Amino acid sequence: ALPPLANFKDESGNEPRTLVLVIGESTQRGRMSLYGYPRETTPELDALHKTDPNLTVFNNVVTSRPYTIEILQQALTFANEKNPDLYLTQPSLMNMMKQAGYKTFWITNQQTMTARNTMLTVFSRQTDKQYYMNQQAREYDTNVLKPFQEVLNDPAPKKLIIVHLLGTHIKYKYRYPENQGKFDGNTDHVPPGLNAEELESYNDYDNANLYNDHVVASLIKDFKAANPNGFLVYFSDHGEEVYDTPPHKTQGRNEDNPTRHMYTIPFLLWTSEKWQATHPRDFSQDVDRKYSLAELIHTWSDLAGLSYDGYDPTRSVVNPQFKETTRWIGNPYKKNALIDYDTLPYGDQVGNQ
């Protein structure tokens, strides 16, 4: 029902390309060894970072809201904390890529009620072809690897592939096979004072991070094995507090009682050799920029070579004209409830910038 973006231009040429957006779940920045966590929770992404110069790791990205649909309404559209309802009145990222001539795919391991009018169902139905892998629980994110390959074989020249993961969502223990609890019973690098149940839950979160590392690295590796022209962005919708913040008694997500560990997220960009060769771009000076996921669509637009009325290059984290803005958090529907993420305590801790 919404009109197209005006003065729409694509400067990325007309060669075939495949672009991938991997939406993780409940994965914070501070429990991944890729971001300095002393437990080896992400060995495959670490090794990829050491050996592949085209993996760009962004160190200062946070989400704006710690609830899945509430953040995805901002991340996937032009809505943000100051204007949270723009997802109703302006196009989404998927709409935008359709206007650019891409065939769009939605692969997901999240339980989607296709017969019901949920906001996630609407988003996933905005694409040309959907793969719902979790329609009924022990369903692991490796479920997406087979349809991913299938979509990679799809002959459309320009393709957008969205992969929606369960990531490290509660309950953490169910995100990974029972025989892959690498950190079960381990007390190294654990905060003090946990009881048996809290300790088990903490280690379960690190195990889920290990499996999620395997899944994201597998998506990158399979994509690379297709020798594609394109790139893949991986982000988590939001983080998750798991006894990280002193006094180490809190587990979960609470927007009215925010901690940094609920808001820090991984943010990775893998660029294929063909795309980097054809679209040379240096990101090495962008990796520490303070950025909010709420403006993702501009970054995506920048990476895809798209401009239009409403495009804001200064809010793309890879743009030479990038200008840092306040990273708002807080409920945008309450009266004057927005606060600066930087005001939260414990920002000096590892992975908690």
Pairing mode of beta strands 306-307, 103-108: unpaired
Question: Residue 80 or 124: which CB sits closer to Zn ion?
Answer: 80
Cis ω for the linkage preceding 171 (within 30 of 0): yes
Taking the complex as a whole, the smallest distance from the CB of residue 77 to Zn ion amounts, in Å, to 5
Which x/- pattern, by CB under 5 A, does the window 173-212 give for Zn ion?
Answer: ----------------------------------------
Stretch that binds Zn ion, among 67-75, 257-265, 272-280, 283-291 (CB under 5 A): 67-75
Question: Residue 228 or 330: which CB sits closer to Zn ion?
Answer: 330
Cβ count near 292 (within 10 Å): 25
Question: Residue 164 or 298: which CB sits closer to Zn ion?
Answer: 298
Stretch that binds Zn ion, among 43-51, 66-74, 206-214, 282-290 (CB under 5 A): 66-74
CA-closest candidate to residue 126, choices 99, 156, 157, 166: 99
Question: Residue 210 or 306: which CB sits closer to Zn ion?
Answer: 306
CA-closest candidate to residue 297, choices 59, 48, 93: 93
Question: Residue 74 or 203: which CB sits closer to Zn ion?
Answer: 74
Asked if residue 292 binds Zn ion (CB under 5 A), the reply is no
Taking the complex as a whole, the smallest distance from the CB of residue 5 to Zn ion amounts, in Å, to 14
Taking the complex as a whole, the smallest distance from the CB of residue 78 to Zn ion amounts, in Å, to 5
Question: Residue 74 or 95: which CB sits closer to Zn ion?
Answer: 74
Taking the complex as a whole, the smallest distance from the CB of residue 101 to Zn ion amounts, in Å, to 22
Question: Residue 74 or 264: which CB sits closer to Zn ion?
Answer: 74
Closest chain position to Zn ion (CB): 74
Stretch that binds Zn ion, among 72-80, 137-145, 176-184, 191-199 (CB under 5 A): 72-80
Question: Residue 80 or 110: which CB sits closer to Zn ion?
Answer: 80
Stretch that binds Zn ion, among 51-59, 71-79, 182-190, 323-331 (CB under 5 A): 71-79
Counting residues that bind Zn ion (by CB under 5 A) gives 2
Report the C-alpha gap between 82 and 39 in whole angstroms: 37
CA-closest candidate to residue 344, choices 236, 266, 254, 237: 254
Taking the complex as a whole, the smallest distance from the CB of residue 143 to Zn ion amounts, in Å, to 28
CA-closest candidate to residue 63, choices 276, 309, 240, 320: 240
**Six-digit token pair at 342?**
């930087």
CA angle 220, 153, 93 (to 5 degrees): 65
Question: Residue 76 or 262: which CB sits closer to Zn ion?
Answer: 76
Taking the complex as a whole, the smallest distance from the CB of residue 29 to Zn ion amounts, in Å, to 20
Taking the complex as a whole, the smallest distance from the CB of residue 295 to Zn ion amounts, in Å, to 6
Determine which residue in the list 74, 95, 209, 352 makes contact with Zn ion, applying CB under 5 A.
74
Per CB under 5 A, which of residues 75..134 are in contact with Zn ion?
80
Taking the complex as a whole, the smallest distance from the CB of residue 119 to Zn ion amounts, in Å, to 14
- Find where tokens 């994201």 sit: 216
Taking the complex as a whole, the smallest distance from the CB of residue 86 to Zn ion amounts, in Å, to 7
Binding site for Zn ion (CB under 5 A): 74, 80
